[PDB]
Design a protein around this ligand. Structure first.
Ligand SMILES: Nc1ncnc2c1ncn2[C@@H]1O[C@H](CSCC[C@H](N)C(=O)O)[C@@H](O)[C@H]1O
Ligand SMILES: Nc1ncnc2c1ncn2[C@@H]1O[C@H](CSCC[C@H](N)C(=O)O)[C@@H](O)[C@H]1O
Ligand code: SF4
Ligand code: SF4
Lengths: 321, 320
């Protein structure tokens, strides 16, 4: 409901480092605060501000052109990714209480070893949730992150490393269906989604999602020409994979053309009129935004299946690691 | 039968022994992209990468793609800039413009006529000039500049070719923005001659200026402005943006610089400014005016709002 910007710390950093030019980058939900924050910086420091106006979907999406034009770029809403010279990551952790939703999920647990995952805006609250589940008699573990998702318990739409742990079931804390869906697909374990805003908890089963999707990607079985999508965004670029996929298509008597872009949208893909697309950019596009693409959009593994390169199986999660 | 663009592209690839080729197309030509890629990969040893971003003009080179390939072929626009490995395939129209020119002669009231057009028809202006002179007029074709390279060529952001000694203009092409721009920039009468429909009409900037007046009026009460800068290769005007911010403060207003690639209504809605000043493509300001959710002004209109320009002293926003 509210988010914590480290504003007094940002001002100190600017005044301490004597920055004269300061960049600001916000995910879409936080752009509503950009002008207010610019105002504070310009009124209380001698720096002048440039706000990034582009969509920003994550720490995978750094405005590197802006960073190369300022002394420091403050990037909000996301946990840091990569290692950039002058980019400072401002967490913006959420203050919503997750304990009621966790207790709500307790009566959906079957096993005794429970794992917890969440997104970055709640990772600071997992410790007290783990205490609650251990007080209810269960064992609880919070899996460690990797270089892409640094915080224990943190998952992304493209990274489920925190869910690779010695437990039997998971509780996902947060909103939406795609994160717990991905965890259930990645681990093949039971996942309860506990929404802290609604204080409701539901089992997220992947069988429906895998089954309907499998039947649909078989539409691409008959595709002859593929567009292989590559994004230039700072943390989504997979050109070497795209060139491997193009070679595998040719090996199997089909054709892929590499299409290089920044934003991946249906409007820009409709114009090319390939039979189907393979997405090497943000993998959440493939399973969410793709529902209203006019041609099939496949993960790299799904592409290999349609080609005959690998044997059929339900969709695995396309991870970036 | 002879594809002129494709044969030139293949010969260029063969001569320069390119192994990695980029293709960049504007919106209406992307439907040819895979077919051209297929020909290149079939008939040369090159691998092709297609730009998937929107492309609005030669002001909008995919420089990331250019730095990823041996040669980038950019379609639909006359060149601008000095990119070492970008080849411009102008994709010119072959329609006979002479019938529209003769139709425009009916509406002329002066003896000394200037000719302007877009890249589509620039190779046909010499013939049109010859026809206008043999029907009793004087005719001149103004020279362009480093941005609108061909004689008589105008862009939505460049009317240099219309700054020439004449009394009246014939614009050859479709759409009315360019001849309106010429009429406003020169204060001369402009006849617009559409060669596809073969018709000619006088353009009147009256409705256009009245519409711009409405956006100026709304922004007059704005306290906080977003000043838009684009990173596109030929649209970047950060120094202008910084000047406009200073003039805003001089006049008791506030402007914040916002740097972006694409300029869209959805992206401006996200920010809490009262109004915006656009230093990127000036056609954004006009074309999308009705879809923006706050007034979007040209730099000159911003000057009017702040009290630095007379409201009657409207000028076209040009990239020079
Ligand atoms: N290259 C790209 N082009 C267009 N949209 C993108 C994109 N990358 C991400 N997105 C958008 O951002 C959404 C993911 S954002 C929410 C996921 C979050 N980053 C996480 O991993 O936890 C996608 O559904 C898509 O709508
Ligand atoms: N940076 C940008 N972001 C979004 N749209 C842009 C843009 N630059 C140009 N456009 C789009 O492209 C349109 C101009 S297209 C016709 C202009 C042509 N290049 C000429 O000069 O003759 C604008 O109306 C706008 O809708
Ligand atoms: S799921 Fe997409 S938007 Fe989220 S971090 Fe991964 S690549 Fe970025
Ligand atoms: S009018 Fe806009 S799109 Fe056309 S050349 Fe000028 S800046 Fe580019």
């Amino acid at each position: 409901e509210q988010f914590d910007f480290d504003l007094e710390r940002i001002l100190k950093t600017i005044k301490d480092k004597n920055c004269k030019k300061v960049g600001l980058q916000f995910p879409e939900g936080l752009k509503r605060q950009a002008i207010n924050i610019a105002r504070e910086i310009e009124e209380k420091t001698r720096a002048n501000v440039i706000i990034s106006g582009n969509p920003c979907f994550g720490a995978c999406d750094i405005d590197t052109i802006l960073a190369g034009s300022v002394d420091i770029l403050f990037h909000f809403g996301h946990a840091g990714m990569g290692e950039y010279e002058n980019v400072v990551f401002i967490e913006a952790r959420s203050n919503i209480d997750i304990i009621p939703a966790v207790k709500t999920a307790l009566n959906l647990l079957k096993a005794n070893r429970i794992g917890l995952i969440t997104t970055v805006q709640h990772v600071h609250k997992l410790e007290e949730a783990c205490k609650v589940i251990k007080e209810y008699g269960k064992e609880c573990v919070i899996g460690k992150g990797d270089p892409r998702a640094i915080y224990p318990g943190q998952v992304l739409g493209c990274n489920f490393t925190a869910a690779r742990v010695d437990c039997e079931e998971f509780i996902y804390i947060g909103s939406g269906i795609f994160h717990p869906l991905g965890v259930a697909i990645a681990t093949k374990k039971r996942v309860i989604a506990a929404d802290p805003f609604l204080n409701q908890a539901v089992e997220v089963s992947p069988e429906r999602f895998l089954r309907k999707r499998g039947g649909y990607i078989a539409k691409a079985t008959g595709a002859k020409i593929f567009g292989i999508i590559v994004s230039t965004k700072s943390g989504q670029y997979r050109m070497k994979l795209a060139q491997k996929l193009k070679e595998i298509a040719d090996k199997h008597g089909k054709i892929g053309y590499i299409i290089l872009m920044d934003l991946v949208t249906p409007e820009q893909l409709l114009a090319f009129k390939a039979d189907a697309y393979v997405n090497t950019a943000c993998p959440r596009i493939t399973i969410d935004d793709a529902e209203r693409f006019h041609a099939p959009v496949l993960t790299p593994q799904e592409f290999e299946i349609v080609l005959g390169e690998r044997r059929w199986e339900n969709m695995e999660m396309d991870e970036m690691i």
